[PDB]
Every structure is written in C-alpha cells, then in structure tokens.
Amino acid sequence: LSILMLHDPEARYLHKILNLLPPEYYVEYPLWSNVVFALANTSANYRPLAEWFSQKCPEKWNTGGKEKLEKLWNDASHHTEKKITKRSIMYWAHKHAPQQYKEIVEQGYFSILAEYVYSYNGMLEHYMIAKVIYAMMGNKFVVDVDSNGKYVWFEFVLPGQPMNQGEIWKWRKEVNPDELHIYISENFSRVMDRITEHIKYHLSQPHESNILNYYKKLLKAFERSKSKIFNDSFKKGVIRQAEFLFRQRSFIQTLDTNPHLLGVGNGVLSIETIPAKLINHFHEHPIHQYTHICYVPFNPENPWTKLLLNALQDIIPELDARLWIMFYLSTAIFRGLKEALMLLWLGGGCNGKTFLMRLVAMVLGDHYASKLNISLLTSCRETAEKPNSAFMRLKGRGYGYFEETNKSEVLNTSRLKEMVNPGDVTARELNQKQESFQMTATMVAASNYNFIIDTTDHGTWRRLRHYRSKVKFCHNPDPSNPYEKKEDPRFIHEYIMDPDCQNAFFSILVYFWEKLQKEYNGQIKKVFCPTIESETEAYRKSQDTLHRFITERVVESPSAETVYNLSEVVTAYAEWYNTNINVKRHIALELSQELENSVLEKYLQWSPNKTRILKGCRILHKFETLQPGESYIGVSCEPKNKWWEWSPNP
Amino acid sequence: EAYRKSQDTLHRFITERVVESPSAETVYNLSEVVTAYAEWYNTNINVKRHIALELSQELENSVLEKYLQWSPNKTRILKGCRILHKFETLQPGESYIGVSCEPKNKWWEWSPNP
DNA sequence: TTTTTTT
Ligand SMILES: Nc1ncnc2c1ncn2[C@@H]1O[C@H](COP(=O)(O)OP(=O)(O)NP(=O)(O)O)[C@@H](O)[C@H]1O
C-alpha cells in the first residue's frame, strides 16, 4: 500500500507524530474523527488517515466503519467553516509526552537542518545537507562498493517514474544518483525556503537587547549559502559525501542470491510457496535483474495458452515424453542447485527445435538464460588463465541451450562432468580476476545427426538424456503421414516475438514447475517416462562399441587350440576402431582393464606367467569367415483432449 | 608397495617377453632389449616416446644384469635368454627370467601407542 | 588486461 510514500518524507514525519499521539484516540470514534478533520485541514491527500490506519487500529472501533470515516474526510476536504491547524496536533503531542515529543522531533529533517544552520551561523557545507538528504531520502537509494573498488548507486523504482520497461519494484543500477541531484535543486530548495521563513519570523520578534543584529547576520549568511544548492561542484561534493551515509555493506553480494525470487515485468514473482505470488508493492528483497515478461496466472482458456498447448501437443506426440520435457524445461526458472541432468534433442529436418528452446530462452531473458556455443562441449579445453568469456555466460542463469553441430561432433566428457554436476566451476572473466561460481543451469542441446560418447563409465551416463523428434514439419508437401504436419512460419517469425505468447508460455512454465513441486518432491528422476528411458538405453547401447565388437568379431570355437591374449584383442579393437569413427588414439592399459569386466570374464582365465591366456574365442580378423561350430560369446494412454494435469498413475 | 610394483612396466616386460633359454646362443645387445621394451610399453602401456640411452640404463639396472655381459668389442649383450618376440613362444627350459583392526565403540579415537 | 602471440 506504501502507507509512508518514499516520494514524500513528510508522510513519515507525520506518522511519527501520529504514533506520538496518546492511545486514547486508539479504538474510539469522536476525537479520532477530530484529529482526522484537523489533519485533512492541514493536508487532504489521503496520507494522514492512512497513517491513522497504519499506526493505530483501522476499524477495530467499528468493523466495516471505514466508509463513515471516508465520508467525514470528504466533508473535511470540502469547504469547512472550522479550520484546525497542525499546531493543535503538536499541542496534543506535547500534552501526552513532552520528552517523547522532543526526542521524536530531533530526528526530523527540518530539525537537523535548522540545528546546523543555527549552530554554524548559516554556513552550510557538504556533509550537513548530505545528512539531511539521507534523513529524508534514505529508503529509496543505496550505495555499495563493487569488485573494482568503485561506489555504485542503486535506486528503488516506484510506479510513477520515468522508468525503463520492466524495472518496477526493483533496484536499478546508477553510475550517478540522477534523481538525488534534481531532488537537491528542487525538494531540498523548498525546505531551505521554509528555514528562510523561520528566520524571518524570528527577525519579526522584538529587538530585545542585541539579538536582532545577530539575526540579520544569520539571514544574510543563509541567503548567501542558499544559492550553493544549484552549483555543480557543491552538488558533486554533497553526493560524494552522501556515499558514506547511504552505504550498505553487504548489498551487492546479496543482490541476486535468492533462487525463489524472479524479477518480472510487473514486479517480483515469488515461487517460495504454492501458489506462486506476485509482489507488486514495496518489499525488502534485493532484486536487480529481471525479465521483460509479465506474470499472469496459468489459465488454459486464454487463446494464446490454448495455441501454445496445442503446439506442444504437435511437437511431442508421446504424452509421457511431453510431460517429462515440460517438467525438465520448467526447472529453468529455478537458479539454485539442481540435479545433474542433460538433455540431447535430435531432429532430422524442420522440427520443434529453435522454437521451443528459443521460446524458453526468450521468456527467461538475457539475465536468466543464454545461448551457448558447441565449442564449450566438443573442443578441447583451453589453459585456465586465458579469460574464457564464453564460459562466463552461465554464471547466474538457470537455462542454457546449444544449437550447432558440424558433422556428428564428439563431445568432451570432462566438460560434460564439469558443466552438469552441482559443484563449483573456476573461470576467469575477461580483464578480471579468476573466480569460482556455482553451476545452476538446465542445459539442452539440439543436434542434426548425433553425438559420439567415447566413454562408457557410469559417471557420464547417469547425467545424459536423449530424445528424438518424431514429427516432420513440411507444410507444402504434407502427406497422409500422421507424424507429418503442415507448418506455419509464424511460429518462428511472429509468435516467438509476440509478448502475449511469451507471457502465456511463461505461465505454462510456472504451472509445470508447481506441478513438479506438488506431485513429486521437485525431483525429476521420479518422473516415470518409459519413452525417454528407452531412447537413452538404445542410444547408450549404440554408443557402447565394446559389446558390438564382442558380438561381431569374437566367436565361440569348440576345441580351439589357439591362444588369444589381451594385446591381440586390444590390437584387433584398434584396427576395428580404425575402421570405426576416427583414428582415436587411446590407452591400451585402460582398454585392458575395461575389457577385463566386459562379457568375456566368464571365459577369461589366468596364466602361469601372471598374464591373461584366454583360450578359444578366435577372432575373425576379416570379413565373413564363419565358424563351423556354433554359439556366440556376446549372447546374441494418450490424453483425451486434455493434459498438463494428467496424473492417474502418480 | 602394490601400486609401485604394478607401475613398474620394465619388470612386467622382462617377466612377459624374456624367458631363460638354456644353452641359447641368442645375442641381445641393449638396443634389441630397448626396441622390444619400447614396443611392449607402447603396445601394453600408453604409446609414448622413449630415450634409447635412458632405456638402456633402465633395462641394464634389472635381473638382465645376471644374463647381461660385455662383448669383446665392449658392448652390453644378453647371453641366451631368447626373447618371445610374440605371444607364447616361451622357452620351457629353465622357465622364464622374470620371477613369476575393528572399531569397538567409537572409531574417531584409537590406540595412542598401538 | 586485453589485443596479442604463444604456435
Ligand atoms: N508446432 C508447430 N506448428 C506448425 N509449424 C511449426 C511448429 N513448430 C515449428 N513450426 C515451423 O517449423 C519451421 C521449422 O523451423 P525450425 O523450428 O527453426 O526448424 P528446426 O528444425 O528447429 N532447425 P533446422 O532443422 O536446422 O531447420 C518454422 O518455420 C516454424 O514456423
């Protein structure tokens, strides 16, 4: 409600006096209305009755009796014979508690400025008006020192302001306090004028003995010093001195650290509790970054929401795969520690990639999502003192997507383990110091052919997920093929640029995040989808070349007198891999311990020369050459016009 | 100790590819051993470059000393001890050359003087 | 501190 508006410190000044009033006005009709009438006589702008509602009880005297007091305030605001001044309010405050009244009024802005003026004979300096400005404007601005050692200003943005779009109810960064400078030459000038009038009143008093010459000297000196408010160097010195008063010591390091708060175009979205709420009023959460998308609650009757849900049904035909992909993409709005997962999307031609992943990126914005290049995953890493500015593009963001594949790229598994696990990553920002941060990103890679996984350890395969698109988008040549559908170019040209479509998709993402938090305990491994698991299993078995070599080249041989040791089969694997993907020089010791388990452990035996003397299992080492014996060693409901709420099985 | 024994590739090469051939006239200068060990290391261990001289000193400091002798031309030679040069193909005679508590209540604290 | 140029 902002009962004490930050643009008017006299509301806070008057609220202190209303607290200072005796509690006999609390829970009573007549004198409460008398003070309301007096306060409306002094200033009728809905401020002092709001302060009455805040400090004391709003309607405890009569529930539903607000409108009677509103009508009384209206009658006070109209022409009123009686006109009670504010001096009656000061008289009542002094009557209730004189010492408390005095102690309350020493901390006001006018008393601080008047004390400075009287104690320094009208000579005003930088720290004095900096202190007054901090007293009257200290809740709207903040100062902190960044990593480079510079003092940076931050301003809280209110609805009525020349504001960049999406900045409301947040802290915006300022290289200079633009508003404070104007405030000094405007609002502060007004209070200076009030002090001038007070000095004129004290001049209008009788001469007494010698105080009148002192008063004219004070008036002359203050009139000389009053012009310094509009001087550029004086204002610069005032702002420089105000940096030590507006300073908050741990503001920048706290600035975007709550992962349950998300800056959005109409305020701050809080996903701490279900349902998620929209803070569009004053608050104390430090929020700087935001997205341009405004948060509206999820409503399927919206035409854009209906269009987007139909599009989602078009892109992914399987219901369980659609639910899993939506649950996975919903975790992109969270910027905390999440599970070590990675999704690979494979599509032949015109598919839903670059529409869905780019939609997530555009609804999250530049601060919360980013597009990443495939050189971070495929090429070998650089020496860490080089400032990799592409690796710094996932510091404080919860979503990342790769989009480029040259020709069946082979990804570096060390980079995969580095960029997926919930741990710390060390890298150097360009022209900056080497630093460590936390991995909080949900990652999706879209490919056109495939990815080659060289390793077969449990570490890289417990964090890899694979999906293949089953829908081809060919509008002109759309045959009876069910998986074949006619396309609209608008989805890539107009719908992805439309703010209403982005708002609807963000609402869908928030709804699916809440669904994941409700049905499961936010854990995505409990999402039971057989299609994704089966596709990952098939992809893993395709990438595992050990079993393919053992089933293809190694055959059962009855009564075989030939002896095949580990160097022979390692060289056979070397020539097989020469006929496979690429040259791929490897380590023979690790290949020996890797085929140590394999599936030949049943037939493998020990040698007197502490070696491996595996008998039988003659390799073909050519094409065909079939064994005359036998055997092989390698042992060779859809949603009913409704979804996004489906949960009979869970 | 087990890891240091398993990381000694020269001992493994001598055990695997060098066998005590009795009454063998096979002449094996350090260069032959260096080449054989280099292939053995690259084939069994990770392929990597080797220093011929350093390798000669390495193989020199081993059981080879027993069967390693100077030549009339002052050249290190391995008397007999035919090398396998391939899988099996070992000398049966004279066999090969390469020899072939409980926490009770709390575990954080223990015997100060075991 | 980068660009570089390490190569
Ligand atoms: N649900 C949908 N319904 C109709 N048309 C769609 C839908 N999703 C995408 N399209 C269209 O499909 C076309 C293919 O574009 P795009 O999605 O970028 O292809 P892509 O597979 O992602 N990338 P690429 O395979 O290299 O061409 C675009 O013109 C979209 O407008």
3-state SS, one letter per residue, for A307-346: HHHHHHHHHCCCHHHHHHHHHHHHHHHCCCCCCCCCEEEE
B15, A609: Cβ pair inside 8 Å? yes
Residue A254: DSSP 8-state: G
Rounded Cα distance between A540 and A547, Å, is: 11
Dihedral sign, CA of A84, A88, A90, A96?
A: negative
Cβ-proximal residues to A3 (8 Å cutoff; 6+ apart), any chain: A11, A15, A50, A51, A53, A54
At CA A615, angle to CA A610 and CA A620, rounded to 5? 125
Whether the CB-CB separation of A178 and A240 falls below 8 Å is answered with no
Select from B31, B26, B24, B20 the least CA-distant residue to B66. B20
Per-residue flag: A586 CB under 7 A of strand C: no
Rounded Cα distance between A501 and A363, Å, is: 9
CB atoms closer than 10 angstroms to residue A343: 21
- Tokens representing A515 are 């669904």
3-state secondary structure of A483: coil
3-state SS, A413-430, equals HHHHHHHHCCCEEEEECC
Q: How far is the CA of A385 from the C1' of C4 (A)?
A: 15
- Tokens representing A482 are 């069910």
- Identify which of A491, A495, A505 to mutate to test ligand 1's pocket (most ligand atoms within 8 A of the CB): A491
Rounded Cα distance between A302 and A339, Å, is: 33
List the A261-264 sheet strands across, edge first. Answer: A261-264, A267-270, A277-279
Whether the CB-CB separation of A572 and A619 falls below 8 Å is answered with yes
Whether the CB-CB separation of A430 and A521 falls below 8 Å is answered with no
Rounded Cα distance between A326 and A470, Å, is: 17
Burial label for A99, CB within 10 Å (0-12, 13-18, 19+), is exposed
Rounded Cα distance between A54 and A68, Å, is: 18
Rounded Cα distance between A479 and A1, Å, is: 59
- Helices of type H across A80-210: 87-96, 98-106, 109-119, 126-137, 178-185, 187-204
Give contacts of B49 with chain A, Cβ < 8 Å: none
Distance from CA of B49 to the nearest CA of A (A): 14
Whether the CB-CB separation of A191 and A164 falls below 8 Å is answered with no
Rounded Cα distance between A180 and A229, Å, is: 12
Q: List residues in chain A that are followed by a break over 2.5 Å (C to N).
A: 636
- Write the CA distances from A109 to A12, A137, A247, A497, integer angstroms: 11, 10, 19, 49
Which residue's structure tokens are 């670059």? A354
Nearest CA in chain A to B95: A609
Select from A308, A307, A320, A427 the least CA-distant residue to A356. A308
Residue A57's Cβ-side half-sphere holds a number of Cα atoms within 13 Å equal to 14
Rounded Cα distance between A419 and A460, Å, is: 12
The interaxial angle of helices A211-226 and A187-204, nearest 10 deg, is 160
- Tokens representing B107 are 């575990």
Burial label for B14, CB within 10 Å (0-12, 13-18, 19+), is buried
Q: How far is the CA of B47 from the C1' of C5 (A)?
A: 31
At CA A418, angle to CA A412 and CA A422, rounded to 5? 145
Select from B19, B102, B30, B85 the least CA-distant residue to B60. B30
Rounded Cα distance between A226 and A243, Å, is: 22
Whether the CB-CB separation of A155 and A174 falls below 8 Å is answered with yes
The resolution of the experimental structure, rounded to one decimal in Å, is: 2.8
3-state secondary structure of A549: helix
Which residue among B46, B87, B100 sits closest to A567, beta carbon to beta carbon?
B87
- Write the CA distances from A118 to A114, A121, A222, A541, A600, integer angstroms: 6, 5, 10, 87, 98
Rounded Cα distance between A199 and A221, Å, is: 11
> How close is the Cα of A362 to the center of ligand 1, in Å?
16
Which residue among A563, A571, A588 sits closest to B88, beta carbon to beta carbon?
A563
B47, A563: Cβ pair inside 8 Å? no
Q: Is some CB atom of chain A closer than 8 A to the CB atom of B100? A: yes
Ligand 1 atom, smallest distance to A490 CA: 31
Distance from CA of B108 to the nearest CA of A (A): 28
Rounded Cα distance between A494 and A461, Å, is: 38
Q: Is some CB atom of chain B closer than 8 A to the CB atom of A565? A: yes
Whether the CB-CB separation of A263 and A270 falls below 8 Å is answered with no
Distance from CA of B80 to the nearest CA of A (A): 19
At CA A424, angle to CA A276 and CA A421, rounded to 5? 70
- CB proximity under 8 Å: A 578-597 to B: 585, 587-589, 592
Rounded Cα distance between A342 and A49, Å, is: 57
Identify the experimental approach: cryo-EM
Give contacts of A568 with chain B, Cβ < 8 Å: 87
- The maximal CA–CA distance of chain A, rounded, in angstroms, is 134
Omega of the bond prior to A275 within 30 degrees of 0, cis? yes
At CA A457, angle to CA A451 and CA A459, rounded to 5? 85
At CA A585, angle to CA A582 and CA A590, rounded to 5? 125
Q: Is A366 annotated as a binding residue?
A: no
